[PDB]
Design a protein around this ligand. Structure first.
Ligand SMILES: [Mg+2]
Lengths: 60, 133, 237, 173, 45
RNA sequence: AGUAGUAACAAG
RNA sequence: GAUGAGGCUAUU
RNA sequence: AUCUAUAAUAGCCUCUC
């Protein structure tokens, strides 16, 4: 990143943490992520990968 | 023995640039991947319940015999011998910061070889491979 | 279909054939022909394995009626097939280790103590010699193999280890099996080459399907709509 | 601010913030947009051709060669039969025995896929029979209470089992 | 090494013990009486 | 009392 | 009553 | 050129107010 800085410009680093990381992430978004990632997989594997986000969406 | 039959050179003070590389921790006379080593150990110690005679073991067949010669009448628990064989065969490779000496004989002394501001000349005992030279 | 197999072959034979197929991951219903082949192979294996017994002097002798159970101590032949892969491999490795012979690369069907050899018994539908040579291609001499055929054609190995009575009995049993399956109109059932691609199965039940259906973001009625939307729509911009 | 409804499987109150209204301030927000997530994933895929396919193939192979005993490698795990925490191996063995009670023998096949299929099917069983731990209390003068646990058969309904399977046991770190 | 098999532990142990007894008898490790006792016990199991 | 700190111990 | 993941370490 | 390959248990470090 330092070498890739445009000549004469400025490079700035942000040290950051995410607030309420766990409270705000949604299992439905993870189900969508799993569906997108396993696009070219057999149906059985897609269902298997979808199970866990489904279980987390209905967690008690 | 490698530590004892070793010579120590001068210690120098100055900048040392260390790069993090995946290096072997301890020297091994014979090195094979964990699956091959496990197959060889099973053949040596538990030939009866060894399973399929994998062709990958062919190269080591002679070695197995040798080991079966040494452990024919050993009253030691088989698991301890198996882990001895794993120590002698299976390789442990870790990411460590090194500077100009990556041979396993030097990685053993890595804590004493150098820091970030000093270098220690070390001559390990034993023998060194022609490839390393 | 399966009624004939259940009636003719004993419970142990069918159980062991089913276990072997499960080990090989083949559905018995989709491939009953393989079930029948394994059953007949195990039947011939046991028939040959139940024809000699080692004596106190280590010599084979035949069996007959009127003999007590105590007399039959150790069989002449040890059966390898019809057993779980792990147990059979352990048996073969133990025999090889204790008889000073290298372990053959492939699992055997029987072991003979008199000659201390591994026997690969095979059943062929075509020429016996052709199948014998094809099986010879693998190892050849490391495992003396003998082939039987449905046309009363046999190819015994170089070192014969059985008498004519046993071979005749095996051939007669095979012929009786052929006759009963022919009169029952099952030969065409087995001859058919019907083996479609088979893969892993993971089906979803009612409860999990409904849980997934209600586990979708707002704007989707069910999970099928979600999957179609994810697969097809372009989210660019 | 998301969609609130009642779960038809368990009867619980469900809140769905996905695809919800965009935040109007800087407070924490769970209203992720599916379209934006998919766009980010598409960007990741096109920066890394074949990455998703390769990862899915590798995961599929690993799952295909994975055994049930892999579930024994965890720490204290929630046991639904006793509704407590037990070592991962203990919880797995108890679940396997309970499934054997309820005509669910997938674990015998050895692989993880049959066991997970067994779990899915167990979610559908109208009634669940298992082994639980019951304590007998005795009065030891000093008076103190002495607890003797023992194994007893127990039964729960479909909804109770479903809720237990979805339950998370909470503690303090 | 983790043992592998879809069969019961009892069956594997029984077959292993049967093989051990037979090979000991053939190698002379076990005499007649002990082999008979082992065979009877295995058959009972 | 005290320790301690959003909840506990100060025996069961 | 003490969880998930990653890295390193010791032992069987 | 270490990329491969790698059983289990335990510990230490890192990652809602
Ligand atoms: Mg930070």
């Amino acid at each position: 990143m330092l070498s890739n800085c445009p000549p004469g410009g400025i490079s700035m680093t942000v040290t950051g943490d995410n607030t309420k990381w766990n409270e705000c992430l949604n299992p439905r978004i993870f189900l969508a992520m799993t569906e997108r990632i396993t696009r070219d997989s057999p149906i059985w594997f897609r269902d298997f990968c979808s199970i866990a986000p489904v279980l987390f969406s209905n967690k008690i | 023995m490698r530590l004892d039959n070793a010579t120590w050179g001068r210690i120098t003070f100055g900048p040392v640039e260390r790069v993090r590389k995946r290096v072997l921790l301890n020297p091994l006379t014979k090195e094979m991947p964990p699956d091959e080593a496990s197959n060889v150990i099973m053949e040596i110690l538990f030939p009866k319940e060894a399973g399929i005679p994998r062709e990958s073991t062919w190269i080591h067949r002679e070695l197995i015999k040798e080991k079966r010669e040494k452990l024919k009448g050993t009253m030691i628990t088989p698991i301890v011998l198996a882990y001895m064989l794993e120590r002698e065969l299976v390789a442990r490779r870790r990411f460590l910061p090194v500077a100009g000496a990556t041979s396993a004989e030097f990685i053993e002394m890595l804590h004493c070889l150098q820091g970030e501001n000093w270098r220690q000349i070390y001559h390990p005992g034993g023998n060194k491979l022609t490839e390393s030279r | 279909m399966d009624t004939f197999i259940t009636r003719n072959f004993q419970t142990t034979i069918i159980q062991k054939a089913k276990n072997t197929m499960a080990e090989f991951s083949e559905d018995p219903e989709l491939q009953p022909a393989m079930l029948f082949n394994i059953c007949v192979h195990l039947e011939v294996c046991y028939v040959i394995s139940d024809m000699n017994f080692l004596d106190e002097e280590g010599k084979a002798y035949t069996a007959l009626e009127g003999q007590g159970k105590e007399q039959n101590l150790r069989p002449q032949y040890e059966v390898i097939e019809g057993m779980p892969r792990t147990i059979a491999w352990m048996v073969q490795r133990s025999l090889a280790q204790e008889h000073g012979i290298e372990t053959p690369k492939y699992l055997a069907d029987l072991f003979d103590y008199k000659t201390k050899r591994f026997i690969e018994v095979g059943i062929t539908k075509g020429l016996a010699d052709d199948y014998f040579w094809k099986k010879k291609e693998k190892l050849g001499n490391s495992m003396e193999l003998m082939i039987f055929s449905y046309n009363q054609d046999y190819s015994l190995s170089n070192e014969s280890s059985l008498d004519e009575e046993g071979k005749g009995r095996v051939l007669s049993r095979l012929t009786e099996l052929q006759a009963e399956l022919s009169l029952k109109n099952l030969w065409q059932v087995l001859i058919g080459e019907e083996d479609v691609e088979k893969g892993i199965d993971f089906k979803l039940g009612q409860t999990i399907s409904r849980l997934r259906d209600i586990s979708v973001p707002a704007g989707f009625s069910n999970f099928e709509g979600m999957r179609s939307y994810i697969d097809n729509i372009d989210p660019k911009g | 601010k998301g969609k609130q409804y009642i779960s038809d499987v368990t009867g619980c109150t469900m809140v769905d913030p996905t695809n919800g209204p965009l935040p109007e301030d800087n407070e924490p927000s769970a209203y992720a947009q599916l379209d934006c997530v998919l766009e980010a994933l598409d960007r990741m895929d096109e920066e890394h051709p074949g990455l998703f396919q390769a990862a899915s193939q590798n995961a599929m192979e690993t799952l295909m060669v994975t055994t049930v005993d892999k579930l024994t490698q965890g720490r204290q795990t929630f046991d639904w039969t006793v509704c407590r925490n037990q070592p991962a191996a203990t919880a797995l063995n108890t679940t396997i025995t309970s499934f054997r009670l309820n005509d669910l023998n997938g674990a015998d096949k050895g692989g993880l896929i049959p066991f997970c299929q067994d779990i899915i099917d167990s979610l559908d069983r109208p009634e669940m029979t298992f082994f639980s731990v019951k304590n007998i209390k005795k009065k030891l003068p000093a008076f103190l209470i002495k607890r003797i646990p023992m194994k007893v058969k127990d039964k729960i309904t479909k909804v109770e089992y479903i809720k237990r399977a979805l339950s998370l046991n909470t503690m303090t770190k | 090494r983790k043992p592998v098999g879809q069969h019961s532990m009892l069956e594997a142990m029984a077959h292993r013990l049967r093989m051990d007894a037979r090979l000991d008898y053939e190698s002379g490790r076990m005499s007649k009486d002990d082999f008979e006792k082992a065979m009877a016990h295995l058959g009972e199991i």
